[PDB]
Design a protein around this ligand. Structure first.
Ligand SMILES: Nc1ncnc2c1ncn2[C@@H]1O[C@H](COP(=O)(O)OC(=O)[C@@H](N)Cc2ccc(O)cc2)[C@@H](O)[C@H]1O
Ligand SMILES: Nc1ncnc2c1ncn2[C@@H]1O[C@H](COP(=O)(O)OC(=O)[C@@H](N)Cc2ccc(O)cc2)[C@@H](O)[C@H]1O
Lengths: 356, 353
């Protein structure tokens, strides 16, 4: 037989999946998992705690498309109970659920392939099998000491510095339980969530569980301003939101940090690299004749090169980044304009006060 | 009208007299005027054989409370025992112990309509959303340090490695109080911190219906300095299934300092178990040692012991005899009810963790 084309295919698949990742734990387990002649279950989880920003909408969608076009199933875990537990929207569950419904409406208009995508609500799923779920949570809690768990504080945007409520011990125990409860093959969350993903791998070793989840962390999309490592709602003025208008996006991009001929810590370059290039498979720099005219970058290396050496002005990088982000947002805008029910949902959502 | 206030008053006096400490007496009165059928509960980790505090001592309090129209829930804390690593965390063993607990309780004075045997696992799982929602809401109300103040309710301390289970457990025990609609928490004083936690949670949440804590005193262990009979304090306990000779053996070896009442385990048993059960204490002994004497008050018993009128050996012989008398229905039930007998035999095999 010449099924050496299968090994070649897996390696092609592995390299493609990894190209979208910031850190894989571990790459070898991932290859192993891919040879499982079966769909791999991936998931990411979201606190419904305010407006969605483009990391959770546009960037997520690039990654999910890559996965589902390579034999994976993808679960969006609408972590409503988690948001409540973390005091979001003052812990008001009715508001959290409305935000959760809003998130789904966005994701459904993000040009994601839905054949292999699932939206699951934490509260619904847990309450379908509360004995199993809670037994798991308890078993996890008896396996790690308080200090160990306290080092997962980051997964909920918390620190040792603030007053540490017992809920901050339950939450990580519950997030860890999710991984097994949902039978995840691949935890595909942002790098800020990694500590609880590592905790789950540790749990496997402790319980001598052979089926171990692979941690496929993506990098943080940076905020608009210098020094903002993480676009988010809790970093004032860092985020472009999924409901931002065309002029909104233009205005935030124009005001963004984009240092001349430097790529490190440059959020504008980061959007070109992590969002636009993977979406278009090319970056087409449109620029005046005054400035060298249009040029298509077929590779990230060529792009980095022309930027770092001043061939690409910052203004030109900005203008194009803005344009593409607007084009990418257009389907979402169209949905929230043409679907009056979605429009109303967005409307109610914006009225909320973002509690921490 | 008057007789009503007399009724409630006497009752209130009955309830209060048992207790080592009641928080708060006034609230208890309000509770009785509001409802004659109060819900009281105590909770037990099925973590090994049941010692006499949880049976003979328990019965005295329970019967005094139920005879007044109260319902008393026995909370078989199976998931709690498992969470707290008892019986090697084997749910099957824990359940078997739970079943044996019920057989002991029904045979030592608590086979009655007003007593309920409830399993934590079962009850939680009838309304899991409500139970767990409560546990979560409690967790977001208290910080870790505050919660670690409840460590004694599970026999743990700050000193040892503190697993996250030791945070969840108190959240769950606190949730139980509301989940079972408890009017009176009737637990040992060693459980008081989580009971205070619940009262603190009410204030935080502006809950006006607030539980009364009616804590009973700890029964000392057999040996010197052991202030609490328990499975954890080594060779400190008399078990409800102990045979006559086991009882004699253990009482004989027990700590019983002459003249001294404080920290005297043997006197404690006489005082807290025997005397309330018989409403007297009949001291059998040789003429030369002082002869038989019937005590009608604890004051006379205490006076005589303090002054050395009763030698430790005479107190021990009599306490052993009485304890054996009190265990007789339990002994018979386990020698006769073959199902209960098999349960015991099996239960005795298990290693305590
Ligand atoms: N700026 C930026 N760049 C790339 N990825 C980002 C990002 N901000 C947030 N993310 C990722 O979005 C997912 C959800 O974010 P979150 O609402 O802050 O999630 C955390 O609160 C989780 N603890 C929610 C959760 C609960 C339970 C469970 O089983 C899984 C997740 C994250 O992947 C984040 O990295
Ligand atoms: N030596 C002694 N004297 C008097 N009372 C005693 C005693 N040792 C134990 N007790 C009381 O018996 C009950 C059961 O004791 P436990 O199994 O050690 O109870 C604790 O583990 C509880 N956390 C179990 C529990 C879980 C959940 C819930 O809602 C209620 C109870 C106790 O009253 C103890 O004081």
């Amino acid at each position: 037989a010449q099924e050496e084309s299968k090994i070649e295919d897996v390696d092609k698949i592995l390299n493609d999946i990894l190209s979208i990742s910031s850190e894989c734990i571990q790459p070898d387990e991932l290859r192993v998992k891919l040879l499982l002649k079966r769909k791999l279950i991936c998931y990411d989880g979201f606190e419904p705690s305010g407006r969605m920003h483009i990391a959770q909408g546009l960037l997520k969608s690039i990654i999910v498309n890559k996965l589902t076009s390579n034999g994976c199933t993808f679960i969006f875990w609408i972590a409503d109970w988690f948001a409540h537990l973390n005091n979001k929207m003052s812990g008001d569950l009715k508001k959290i659920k409305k935000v959760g419904s809003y998130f789904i409406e966005v994701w459904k208009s993000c040009g994601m392939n839905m054949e292999n995508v699932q939206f699951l609500w934490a509260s619904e799923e847990i309450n379908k099998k509360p004995n199993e779920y809670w037994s798991l949570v308890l078993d996890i809690s008896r396996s790690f000491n308080i200090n160990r768990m306290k080092r997962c504080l980051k997964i909920m945007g918390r620190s040792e510095g603030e007053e540490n409520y017992c809920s901050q011990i339950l939450y990580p125990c519950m997030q860890c339980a999710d991984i097994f409860f949902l039978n995840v093959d691949i935890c595909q969350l942002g790098i800020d969530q990694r500590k609880v993903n590592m905790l789950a791998r540790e749990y496997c070793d402790i319980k001598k569980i052979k089926k171990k989840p692979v941690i496929l962390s993506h990098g943080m999309l940076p905020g608009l301003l210098e020094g903002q490592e993480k676009m988010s709602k809790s970093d004032e003025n860092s985020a472009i939101f999924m409901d931002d208008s065309e002029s909104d996006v233009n205005r935030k991009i124009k005001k963004a940090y984009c240092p001349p001929n430097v790529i490190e810590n440059n959020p504008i370059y980061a959007y070109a690299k992590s969002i636009i290039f993977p979406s278009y498979n090319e970056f087409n720099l449109v620029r005046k004749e005054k400035n060298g005219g249009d040029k298509t970058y077929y590779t990230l290396q060529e792009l980095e090169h022309d930027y770092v050496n001043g061939f690409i002005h910052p203004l030109d990088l900005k203008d194009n980044v803005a344009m593409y982000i607007n084009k990418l947002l257009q389907p979402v805008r169209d949905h929230f304009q043409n679907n009056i029910e979605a429009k109303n949902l967005l409307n109610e959502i914006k009225k909320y006060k973002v509690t921490k």
